[PDB]
Amino acid sequence: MDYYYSLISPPCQSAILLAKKLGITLNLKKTNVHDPVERDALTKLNPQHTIPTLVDNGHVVWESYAIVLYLVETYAKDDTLYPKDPKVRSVVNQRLFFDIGTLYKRIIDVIHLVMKKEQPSDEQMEKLKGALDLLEQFVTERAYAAADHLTVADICLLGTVTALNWLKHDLEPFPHIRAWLERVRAEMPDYEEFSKQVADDTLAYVAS
Amino acid sequence: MDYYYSLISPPCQSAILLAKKLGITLNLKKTNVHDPVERDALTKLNPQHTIPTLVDNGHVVWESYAIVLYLVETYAKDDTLYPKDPKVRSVVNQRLFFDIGTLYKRIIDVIHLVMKKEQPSDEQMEKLKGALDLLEQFVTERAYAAADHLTVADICLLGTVTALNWLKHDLEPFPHIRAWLERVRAEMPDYEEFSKQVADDTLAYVASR
Numbered sequence: 001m002d003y004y005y006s007l008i009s010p011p012c013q014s015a016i017l018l019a020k021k022l023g024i025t026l027n028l029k030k031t032n033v034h035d036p037v038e039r040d041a042l043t044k045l046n047p048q049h050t051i052p053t054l055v056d057n058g059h060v061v062w063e064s065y066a067i068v069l070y071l072v073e074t075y076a077k078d079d080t081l082y083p084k085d086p087k088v089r090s091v092v093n094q095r096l097f098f099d100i101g102t103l104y105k106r107i108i109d110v111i112h113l114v115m116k117k118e119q120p121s122d123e124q125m126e127k128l129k130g131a132l133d134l135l136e137q138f139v140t141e142r143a144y145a146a147a148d149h150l151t152v153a154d155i156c157l158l159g160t161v162t163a164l165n166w167l168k169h170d171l172e173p174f175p176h177i178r179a180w181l182e183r184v185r186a187e188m189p190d191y192e193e194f195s196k197q198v199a200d201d202t203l204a205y206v207a208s
Numbered sequence: 209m210d211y212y213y214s215l216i217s218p219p220c221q222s223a224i225l226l227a228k229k230l231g232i233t234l235n236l237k238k239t240n241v242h243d244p245v246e247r248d249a250l251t252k253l254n255p256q257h258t259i260p261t262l263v264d265n266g267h268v269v270w271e272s273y274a275i276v277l278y279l280v281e282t283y284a285k286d287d288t289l290y291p292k293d294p295k296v297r298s299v300v301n302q303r304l305f306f307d308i309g310t311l312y313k314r315i316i317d318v319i320h321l322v323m324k325k326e327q328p329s330d331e332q333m334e335k336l337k338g339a340l341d342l343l344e345q346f347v348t349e350r351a352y353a354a355a356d357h358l359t360v361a362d363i364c365l366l367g368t369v370t371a372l373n374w375l376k377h378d379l380e381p382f383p384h385i386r387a388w389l390e391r392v393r394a395e396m397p398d399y400e401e402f403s404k405q406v407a408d409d410t411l412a413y414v415a416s417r
């Protein structure tokens with residue numbers, strides 16, 4: 001399967017971590033969404049021309065969350081990562097839509113600005129800090145994001161939280177989130193290597 | 209099951225419509241998420257205190273999308289609204305994330321500004337357009353949002369698009385969306401009545417002002 005991405009792209013990280021977890025092998029293809037030549041070809045596959053974008057057996061999937069769920073259904077030998085019990089799955093789903101519509105949303109906004117080098121209103125931080133508060137609670141009731149064990153909600157939420165690195169966000173006030181991060185990364189195969197590049201690549205994007 | 213909501217809220221209309229399509233009884237609970245007393249109450253069940261918020265036999269669920277997918281899986285006698293084939297389900301899922309994070313995000317952003325008597329930048333109106341052109345394409349490659357038949361994608365996107373009504377946003381340039389609109393509503397049980405129920409409530413709400 002083909003996978004158009006950029007390691008510096010938080011959403012692009014989800015499937016990468018998932019693939020290693022499931023032992024799935026992807027055919028990485030570094031994509032520059034600002035290259036008029038690369039956008040076209042990408043657009044021919046995904047009209048919204050955004051990364052990540054998966055192409056498997058000719059079937060196209062975009063939106064990290066849709067990529068991740070497709071992979072689990074299609075390649076996971078079990079349902080542990082995306083439980084079938086509707087009472088558990090609804091928690092995973094809620095967290096996934098929480099990730100894209102609340103948590104990462106507010107994080108991405110401050111980052112975007114921070115790059116533009118402009119002060120985020122003394123109220124955008126509120127929604128930010130408020131987003132984290134919610135997550136702090138989620139990982140207080142249980143040891144994982146949406147269940148008593150690791151799910152694809154943990155993988156997505158991990159990318160969004162570790163993205164708080166761009167901005168300098170002290171995690172001290174969020175012990176559970178800290179405990180949760182360590183526990184989830186402790187289950188991600190090849191994580192350390194992954195963490196280095198991602199960590200180093202960002203500072204290289206900051207170099208500018 | 210209890211359903212904290214308000215027909216004025218576009219996200220809340222998804223579970224209402226879906227409910228009608230599948231014969232599910234919803235114990236409606238009009239909620240003013242702005243009222244502190246109601247706000248605190250909701251919180252106890254949903255720490256985020258946002259509507260829609262469902263409560264099936266003690267099992268709490270929020271995010272119109274999570275509620276939707278939950279009801280279908282739990283009560284749908286069929287899987288047509290949410291196909292099991294990963295090849296199909298990926299499109300539905302993608303279109304759903306397109307809704308919450310692309311189309312509705314750019315719509316509600318504009319509405320929130322107009323509410324604060326502010327104006328959208330040219331960029332914002334451009335992404336608005338951009339999201340629509342995409343939806344326009346989606347409903348051209350197929351008669352429906354994510355497949356050759358109605359799915360939960362159509363229901364959620366239908367809520368999102370009719371929300372454009374608050375901005376008197378012209379859909380004239382979007383032919384397939386207009387067509388697609390008629391198709392979906394013609395398939396929602398007693399739509400005109402729902403739409404009129406929305407109208408009544410919105411008037412009864414603005415009356416609270």
Ligand SMILES: N[C@@H](CCC(=O)N[C@@H](CS(=O)(=O)O)C(=O)NCC(=O)O)C(=O)O
Pocket residue numbers: 006008009010011012033048049050051052062063064065100305309
């Ligand atoms: N919700 C999408 C967000 C992806 C996204 O915003 N991708 C950006 C790049 S990045 O910010 O994640 O690095 C993109 O493709 N931008 C190009 C474009 O929008 O045309 C997902 O989760 O897949």
Ligand SMILES: N[C@@H](CCC(=O)N[C@@H](CS(=O)(=O)O)C(=O)NCC(=O)O)C(=O)O
Pocket residue numbers: 101216217218219220241256257258259260270271272273308
């Ligand atoms: N993503 C959520 C969005 C729901 C939402 O934002 N609800 C608002 C009200 S409305 O804009 O839809 O009318 C709310 O409850 N807000 C209360 C709060 O944010 O505390 C969903 O789809 O359920």
